[PDB]
Amino acid sequence: SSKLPPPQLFNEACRTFQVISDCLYGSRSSDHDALDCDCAEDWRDGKNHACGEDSDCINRATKIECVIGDCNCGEGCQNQRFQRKQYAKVSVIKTEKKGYGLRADTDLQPNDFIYEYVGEVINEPTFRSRMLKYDKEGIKHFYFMSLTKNEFVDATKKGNLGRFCNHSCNPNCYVDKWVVGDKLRMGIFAARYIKAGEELVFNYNVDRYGADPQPCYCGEPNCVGFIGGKTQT
Amino acid sequence: RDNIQGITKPAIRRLARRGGVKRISGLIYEETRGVLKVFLENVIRDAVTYTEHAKRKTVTAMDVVYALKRQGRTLYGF
Amino acid sequence: DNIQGITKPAIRRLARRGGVKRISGLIYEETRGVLKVFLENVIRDAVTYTEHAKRKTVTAMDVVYALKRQGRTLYGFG
Amino acid sequence: RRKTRKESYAIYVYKVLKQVHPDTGISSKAMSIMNSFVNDVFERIAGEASRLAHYNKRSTITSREIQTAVRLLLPGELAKHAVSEGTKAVTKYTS
Amino acid sequence: RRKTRKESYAIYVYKVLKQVHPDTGISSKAMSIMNSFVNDVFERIAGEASRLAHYNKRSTITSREIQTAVRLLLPGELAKHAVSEGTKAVTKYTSA
Amino acid sequence: PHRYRPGTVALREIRRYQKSTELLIRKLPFQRLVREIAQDFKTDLRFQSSAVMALQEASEAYLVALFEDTNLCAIHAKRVTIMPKDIQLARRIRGE
Amino acid sequence: GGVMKPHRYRPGTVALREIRRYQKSTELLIRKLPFQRLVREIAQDFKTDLRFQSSAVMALQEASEAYLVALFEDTNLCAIHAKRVTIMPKDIQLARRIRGER
Amino acid sequence: GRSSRAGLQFPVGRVHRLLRKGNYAERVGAGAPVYLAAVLEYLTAEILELAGNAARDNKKTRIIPRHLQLAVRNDEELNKLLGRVTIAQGGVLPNIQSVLLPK
Amino acid sequence: GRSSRAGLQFPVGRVHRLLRKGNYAERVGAGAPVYLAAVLEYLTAEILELAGNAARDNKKTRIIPRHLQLAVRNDEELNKLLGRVTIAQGGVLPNIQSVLLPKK
DNA sequence: TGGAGAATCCCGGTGCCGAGGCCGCTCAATTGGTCGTAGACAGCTCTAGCACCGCTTAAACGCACGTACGCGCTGTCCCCCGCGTTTTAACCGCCAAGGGGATTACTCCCTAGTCTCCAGGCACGTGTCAGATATATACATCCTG
DNA sequence: CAGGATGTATATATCTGACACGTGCCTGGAGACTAGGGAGTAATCCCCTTGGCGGTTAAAACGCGGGGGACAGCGCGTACGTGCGTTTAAGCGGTGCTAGAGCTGTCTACGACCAATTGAGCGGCCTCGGCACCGGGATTCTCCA
Ligand SMILES: [Zn+2]
Ligand SMILES: [Zn+2]
Ligand SMILES: [Zn+2]
């Protein structure tokens, strides 16, 4: 759609940070060695993608990514994209109530790679230390997502363009776990038809430790006024 | 030659009726002829191997029975 | 009762090696029944070999020969 | 009389048929099937006794090997009655 | 005192492995599997040659009966190359 | 103008051919099939009549068992007709 | 602050991951000691105070696991034939019927 | 005759000769052919008795292959013993699946 | 040695002894053990070659039951010969049905 | 639902060839001696199987949640079935060569058994290396004053 | 606000368990020679296979109308996959005890083996009745008004 129709920067923009694109985590995994598959390529100059983005290649079908250079397809394997950044086109739109939205810049085909949420991955006592120092400092925006149940991610220190999102009770994108370089990572993907201009906002499914969240400004009959998670922690 | 078509459509239909089949797709006839060709090829191959070992020029009934015995589909009465 | 000792996750893993993607909840009782029948036949034949040989211990060779009798010959024990 | 002697089980299957069924005959093809069946079961039991004797480093087929082979090849109630018949026959024969 | 002299095809399978791939080894359990395989193929071929001798009222297993057993047991090119190897072996053996 | 429904004639034929006991393939075409298959192994082979009868019996029994299991697969797939993939499934389960 | 739980894996993804993991490895999938107790219980009904060699129980566990794996392979093929992806008891009974064990 | 002494109709002498000349063992115990003949007599008697019964159930006094077939397939344990066996001219059991019957 | 005369590795003498004392026939021909040893050594060499290639392609230098299992189940002819045998601790071939994969 | 109609079943009548029995014969079955190695049995040794126990921790279990897949319904359409009409070739009986399976006659070389001799193969130490483990070590956490 | 003691991830020298190679020894394999019987080969016969022909007629081919079942979409609900947290036997090692496998020694009963004999059982031929087939009516099943 075109609901979130002067784009902003990253560091009318949000608070400043450092743009990252690599692995700059806390300490670290996934321990799942993806071996070199025998996928037929149909690739010499890019006539078709080798481990195709929507065909039947065994690596991509299970949210597993080939490392660059060791799979039999070589470098034309489209299931290498976390290591080669085949991201979509979003930008930072300023909204007075929704805050900062990832507006789509080109009309996006459904069920494709949109972006990646990268930041700092940390454990639970340092994670609650980050929580305590941030809500004693007085930030009103909280990025305390969980990669796995043990570890946690945060992007306000050293993150990327995936910060400018929110909760919508009707999601357009979603986030799913993938594995790359024996490292568990996160990726935001579309499911429905996406037109250039509207912010790509999904289900957070937060279990907030506080009592007063900002209201869900989705304005839909599916919105209960607040977000809605799993537990009342 | 093309004598494998001698096993005709209604004869395969008869075998199927004896097998309990009620309706038969048109492709079943060619599939059954191919399966039977494979089966008979194997059995006649074993029979001819027994016959050539016995220094005989005629495949006897015993060669066919022993050949079927080798494949766990023993036949009584020959 | 010990047939329930072959637990439901283990049966799931067995299906996983076989390529099964989704498993109905009623499968587990059928699988334990099949396992009981198979083990009953192989163990019965093994015990028959032990009673013949006047030995009290079921030996590996007895199990291999018992399996071979049922057309499921096993390599790697003699 | 200018023909090679080809043995069979015909007359013995016929004797058994007359002992079990008073007024009943049997066709040539049915007798052929029964004769091949008897030769088949004989080959199975003798082969099983042979391999059983080989396994246990024995060189003699005794009553024990035949008994174990019969219990191995015949399922359930058939095996029970067959081992009963075998023991009965050996008991009568040694006396 | 040693326990008991038990025979196996272990050293021959190892010599064949060293003849085909000198820098490759084999696990003990895999050697056991290979020994059971050799004994199995042996038992099948000997059983079939026995049945061939019996069906034709003969009391001698010669190279011809083994050859026919091989042609019955191996499916296709395995049988063709097995008959080639056996012919070579018997020829070289009897002609030296 | 009195016609049977599409399927009752099938059941009457099922009862008929399961009640009778005779070879269902035509003798001479099957004998030509047998001789043709035999030509590719050895030239000018002769066949005893009993050998051709044994082959026809084994052929009919194997096809009957295959069609019975194919029918069980068809009924399993909530259908009453048989398709080629049912025969391929049956032979796959059997082990070829 | 708050913990932000994201979306889990879709049903079947972890299943396929297990498919690849167990088809690539070779370890036994049945617990050894419960299976050994099952073997001794089944053997109880033929001869009292039966003893087993460890290699015999191991050969039984290998044979058992190979038989069940092959049966589930055949069941999966008949299941996938019937336009489902979920095996049912009828599928295993059909597999055993066609194999000739019933 | 050793046959009458053992109370058997099958020839223990013939069985013993086939055992000696059949390449089964180097030595054949004296009780083995008697035991084997007894087991053969039992299996033959069971199949013949069931075929005879089926023949009377088809108003025939002469056993034909179809009756032997019915005899074999209606005994579960014989069916298990003869699961890989085909009886020539035997036919098939009258088995019609429920799903094909009219409703 | 009789093995060296035929250029074989497998023991012709042991095969001859097993044939005579294995109760297969009253008499055993002279060419039978040589021929049988040749067939056994050829089949052993073929399966060990396929296993060796499978192990080398999986970057291992020791042949393991898994590589034997792959050697057997990947060669159609040996698969046909060995369709009803179970190789201990061998597992199965990686085979995922196409239908199990996700859709477009 | 009942009458029409087709199919099948039953019931007697005729012909026929195959089951069932007898006759002559031959070789295999039985009996009695004669012997030689297989195995039954007692005893002894030593491995390994069972039983117990403590400890650690990985998998099983139970519940919660949610989605996607199984299953029932409905429409469409098309393909196989029922059947009639036409055609072709299987089938049955009869005949004519003649090929080759089966037997005979007789020879002869190949293999079992025996005896003589020694080295190849097996059980066992001894050395060597993928793979797992306790250990120095750098950087962040708490910890009390 | 402050260093020291402590916890944690990292690279590491080492420890273990399985595999390659050398050592003594013994038993089975190899070589040599002989006897006898299985088989190899020539020769003959005669059964039954192959080939042909002709008439019958039943089954196969072929065409066409039509119906009902296959197939695809839709919709719906519930059960099974995934995941988290709780618990428990599985596994491992460590320890102890004795049952029984495995080997040996000695002896004997039991079967191999051989010759003579004789009758059981097999081939040939011969006979009559169960059955295969046919015709006529009777029941039974199916389907459309
Ligand atoms: Zn790929
Ligand atoms: Zn790839
Ligand atoms: Zn909302």
Author numbering:
A (entry chain S): 80 to 84, 88 to 93, 101 to 117, 121 to 325
B (entry chain B): 23 to 100
C (entry chain F): 24 to 101
D (entry chain H): 26 to 120
E (entry chain D): 26 to 121
F (entry chain A): 38 to 133
G (entry chain E): 33 to 134
H (entry chain G): 16 to 118
The authors write:
Set2 is recruited by phosphorylated C-terminal domain of RNA Polymerase 2 during transcription and catalyzes H3K36 methylation over gene bodies. In this study, we present 3.8 Å cryo-EM structure of Set2 bound to the mimic of H2B ubiquitinated nucleosome core particle (NCP). Our structure shows that Set2 makes extensive interactions with H3 αN, H3 tail, H2A C-terminal tail, and stabilizes DNA in an unwrapped conformation.
To visualize the mechanism of H3K36 methylation, we assembled the complex of Set2 and the mimic of H2B ubiquitinated nucleosome, the substrate of Set2. To stabilize the complex we have introduced H3K36M mutation, recently identified in childhood cancers. In initial 3D reconstruction, with overall resolution at 3.4 Å, a noisy density representing Set2 domain was present near the DNA entry/exit site of the nucleosome. ~14% of the initial particles contained Set2 and further focused classification improved the Set2 density yielding a map at 3.8 Å (Set2:NCP). Remarkably, not only NCP, but also Set2 is resolved to high resolution allowing us to describe interactions in molecular details. Although we used full-length Set2 for the complex formation, in our map we observe only densities for the AWS and the SET domains. The DNA unwrapping is required for Set2 to bind H3K36 that is located close to the DNA entry/exit site of the nucleosome. The conserved positively charged Set2 residue R117 binds the backbone of the unwrapped DNA at SHL 5.5 and stabilizes the open conformation. In addition to the DNA, Set2 makes multiple interaction with histones H3 and H2A that position Set2 catalytic domain for functional interaction with H3K36. In addition to prevailing charged interactions, our structure shows that Set2 binds hydrophobic patch of the nucleosome formed by the H2A C-terminal tail and the H3 αN. In conclusion, our data show that Set2 interactions with the H3 αN and the H2A C-terminal tail position Set2 on the nucleosome to specifically bind and methylate H3K36.
